[model samples]
Target: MESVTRIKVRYAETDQMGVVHHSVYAVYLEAARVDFLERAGLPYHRVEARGVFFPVVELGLTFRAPARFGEVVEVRTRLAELSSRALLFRYRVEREGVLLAEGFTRHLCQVERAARIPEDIYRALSVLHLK
Candidate 1:
């Protein structure tokens, strides 16, 4: 399943010229991922309370267009891959059909004491598999 999130570019996220800084796009990706998990029956606070946490191990971004301050951008995110200890997510950020960015982030699924992801949680996340 693909997760979607909409966020307005705030003044603090933009430069003097109103162009969103390159770093701000990363927030869009993170928000979309959290939103996706929450909507899919898994929420961050709950998982964290259970000792589950996802940490980004790799990330890549391609900026296609600049989003101006005050514009609402939509982030579409998907779980591209789910492995034994990791999850790969892909994202596309758009402003009304205009592509602003494309990005991917790989996260390591870890828990307290050890990093192996529990089978039950993995199975729950597998329902979103695109394969």
Candidate 2:
């Protein structure tokens, strides 16, 4: 399954060039990821309570166009991969009908040390894995 999160670019997120700053896109991605988790019935806080933490170990992005302040963009997030110890999510940022950027984040599941994701957690998340 895919999740969609909408965010409006804020003035504070813009650069002197009047375009959304590169760093702000990461924040938007996080929002979409968290929203995805909640929609999957696996909110991050609850996962943390279960002693599981997913920390991003790698991130990649490609920008095709620039977004400006006041524009509402939709971040489409999908679970690209899932394993006992690692997960991957891919995202697309679009405004209206145009693509602004796309990215992916790879995360390592941990509990003090690297660990296999618990059965309940894995089962919940796996249902959303891209098919």
Candidate 3:
């Protein structure tokens, strides 16, 4: 299932010119990622407590338009790909149906304590077939 999040751009998220800063898009992606995981019954803190973690291994973003402060934006996130040891998530930011940005994040599943890919994660993710 795809997860979506809506947020209003705060003044702090913008640059001196009043446009959303490029760096802030990463934060948006991160938030969406966490939200998706939580909706999927895998919250970060809870999973971490269980000795599991997903670390970013790749990221790509493209800005299509600038978002002004106070603009209500929607971020759509989806599990684009899944593998035994890694997963890829795609995101798109939009305002009033206008595309603002598109991005993707790839994460490596790892055991929190050992920092290594665990067999359990591989088995669980293998059944997901996210695409």
Instruction: Please tell me which predicted candidate would have the highest TM-score against the true structure.
Output: 2
Q: Which stretches of candidate 3 lie over 4 Å from their true place?
A: 112-131
lDDT of 3: 0.81
Instruction: List, residue by residue over 2-104, the lDDT tens digit for candidate 2.
Output: 7899998888999998899998888899999999999888889988997889999999889999999878999999999998889999999999989999999
In terms of lDDT, model 1 sits at 0.89
CA lDDT of each candidate? 0.89, 0.91, 0.81
Model 3 residue 127 distance off true place after TM-score fit, in angstroms? 6.8
lDDT: worst 10-residue window of model 3: 122-131
Ranking by lDDT: 2, 1, 3
lDDT of 1 by residue, 1-131 (tens): 77779998888999876699999888889999999989988898898998888889899999999999879999999999997788999999999999999999998977755487778888888888856
Q: Point out the higher-scoring one by TM-score: 2 or 3.
A: 2
Model 3 TM-score, 2 decimals: 0.86
* Tens-digit lDDT string for candidate 3 (33-127): 88877776667888778778888889999999999997888899988887666788899999889999999998887773435456655554445
